[PDB]
Symmetry: D2
Subunit: 257 residues, 4 copies
């Protein structure tokens, strides 16, 4: 099947930053034809730690910038929603509606996403066991979702730390396509983070998944969010080529679910 790569800057800092990253993603999509790229960026960071942290430029502006990207590079789009009412307007540009980790259980948000007709990607909450995502998918199908994804982004392990229990990839795969989030899984809520992105991502594809999610920024050192975990845009190509290779050599061993 076709491997999915979801990438983009964490936050829509500006419509300019978006086109910049979009161009590189467009170039990679032309080189890696066996991959399905999806451009990602949040129009709003609805749960920053501090009130003084960057949030976004609004739903209207964000949807507008995301549309420019889709229009100029012909790339699929995905963004996340935080409240039911955002589902409809967001579905006008987003091919995949993403549900935040903390909200993976909110029945109304799930239902709002499902009826749009768009694909849905749920970030598995840090508090959720892998086998309990089964009902999250049941809710979505009930609400009309035909294209569903579950994203592994780590589990709470003590305070201010997340661990990736790779046993979850084959478990969640029983009821949905699985995406490994290479960026948030090494984050420390509130390991040295960055140095582990690449090795864990190798593990993901060795275990087996249907796609990976990576927040990439031209200059992570200057991002308005996830500055310490966003992958430098120049390294994106290398990471991709590498996971496609590992995936290929490992794939014949992938178990049938």
């Amino acid at each position: 099947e076709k491997f999915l790569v979801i990438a983009g800057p964490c936050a829509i800092e500006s419509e300019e930053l978006l086109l910049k990253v979009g161009e590189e993603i467009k170039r990679l999509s032309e080189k890696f034809k066996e991959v399905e790229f999806v451009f990602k960026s949040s129009f709003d960071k609805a749960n920053r730690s501090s009130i003084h942290s960057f949030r976004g430029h609004g739903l209207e502006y964000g949807v507008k910038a995301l549309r420019k990207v889709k229009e100029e590079f012909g790339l699929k789009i995905t963004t996340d929603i935080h409240e039911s009412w955002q589902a409809e307007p967001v579905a006008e540009v987003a091919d995949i509606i993403q549900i935040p980790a903390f909200l993976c259980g909110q029945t109304d948000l799930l239902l709002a996403a499902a009826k749009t007709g768009r694909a849905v990607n749920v970030k598995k909450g840090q508090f959720l066991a892998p086998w309990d995502t089964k009902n999250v998918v049941e809710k979505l199908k009930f609400g009309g979702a035909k294209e569903i994804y579950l994203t592994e982004r780590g589990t709470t392990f003590g305070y201010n730390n997340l661990v990736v229990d790779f046993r979850s990839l084959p478990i969640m795969k029983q009821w949905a396509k699985v995406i490994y989030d290479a960026t948030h899984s090494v984050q420390l809520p509130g390991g040295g983070m960055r140095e582990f992105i690449f090795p864990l991502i190798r593990a993901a594809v060795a275990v087996g998944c249907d796609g990976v999610f990576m927040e990439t920024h031209p200059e992570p050192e200057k991002a308005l969010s996830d500055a310490s975990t966003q992958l430098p845009l120049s390294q994106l190509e290398g990471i991709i080529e590498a996971i496609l290779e590992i995936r290929e050599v490992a794939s014949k061993y992938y178990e049938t679910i």
Copy 2:
């Protein structure tokens, strides 16, 4: 004074909210040194199954709660799930409750703060104690003045929660701490019930400004949390017990 939030988990009917309210009213008259607050949810926004009981709606819920505050003169508290519900609920709710999973949703918090009412934030299972400082700050920025942080357990492996009592003195540095004696023993997704009382005792021995307890006339027949909701008849004894322990232990509560 010492806070005691109690009531049925979900608003199964205005009828139920009145029967439990009656008993709460009676305890209210018996323990003048305790400030009772009636709690009940007009909607279970995150039931595991789509096929579970959510409720009769926000309008019907606010109607029943209003009936309780009128027929018994008891303060009210209910939880909101989306920003738009902060205003309509603040009409009957003396304290707006922020669900544990949503403790980080800035918009939901700012909306709660805007109604001028008191706000009680449930500490997320994924959140470290010291990280609640930022939750309170967001509320102060939004104009909140009476702010409560409630301990309801922390993610411990899969389908399990542990109560790290160190969190009580830690959160107390920036808010009034409430201990949720009911959701702290439930297994997400021990024998639950048998641990409710023992842990409540630990909570007051350590030191907290209040306790949260879901009670139902017939837990077995409850439409939500039927295994962790305390039988109404047992509420009096547990309150009396926590006041006595508090009386003796309070002598040793460390200074913020």
Copy 3:
């Protein structure tokens, strides 16, 4: 029943330090007649993090110092063993043989302790669930132990941190007397530690237990081990009086196991 208080310096730094702390424990035993005091001190720290850390003055010396304490103050004694062969010599002075947390599963060490005829106290391993201590007790009875204790000392919660799941006190109580270790439960393997000793200890007695364990040192700031967690000897009396009070008011509510 009679509440048990196990206290003493973490390590037998010197026979002098032992008599110093022993004197205070002797004085407290005379005041708190409803309490059963047991003097504790390890003749060896068999698992320090670094190789350059203090260990002890040997089994022979330690047993000798512990005997002086028992001889001069008439106090019961307890110390821990790390290998089967130490059981016999140690039982000649120890009223209670203690089994280290990491070794709570070592069948031979348990059996060696059990046949001495002395009482046995097992520190519940940081990796052990409360309901799995049931077999640790089964092993001891099999080996001849008639007086058995289980000590709560925290559970692994992420890296370098322990949490106390008080649900364990009523669980382990189903098959043994339970002791709450007020000192090691707030330690950070490899919370601010000290500031939590007293509140958690209050929780323990409120929940209900048969005794508490507290490492106390005249000058914690100078101890050779557990310097940041050992309680100052001058505060011992206050802590005890407080837990006896909380215990009394709470006891009528203790559930029957």
Copy 4:
């Protein structure tokens, strides 16, 4: 070269150690680029139940192992539980294995180091990756030169272990890292077996210097770890698979 430690969990009989050794010998001849090490315990020192199988003893165990090293010329590794067993075992064992629960017992480590042999320390379920630095240092102080650290999972709530693959590159800073593919999926005190292969693949994709696998002709009839021991017939395929993944992935292993 890449290390592969395999064999039956416990020494059920010299007979069993020879049948598994034969197959290991054959794989040894088939994969010249891999260094096979025969592993088996002469005693299960910490079985949950007193009524479980421990073994036939140290003498009988060292006798069977010796038979394997002679009849097949395969390196040997077994685990020691108390200091006094370091010397007698170092007679047949090329690598002395330190049990996970005992990774911090200074005397057991110094004794293992004294025999001059290679030492493989199992990282305790309670130990943080970076805290293994001290374990290696104790061994160097005791004269150890060939030191291995084995990842076997970390305590995650109750009766469960999780494998934090970040630990591999971290421990690699001060030792050769081995991945225990068998005990990492067992539930202390998921479906275990089904996760053994997937996680082994992750281990080599990340980068490790070797793998540890317990194998038994008939796992179902094994006297220890009958649910997590890999069927002998499957060993060849998994090895071939990890060599292929390694070949491709090794290009990206980060530098220590």
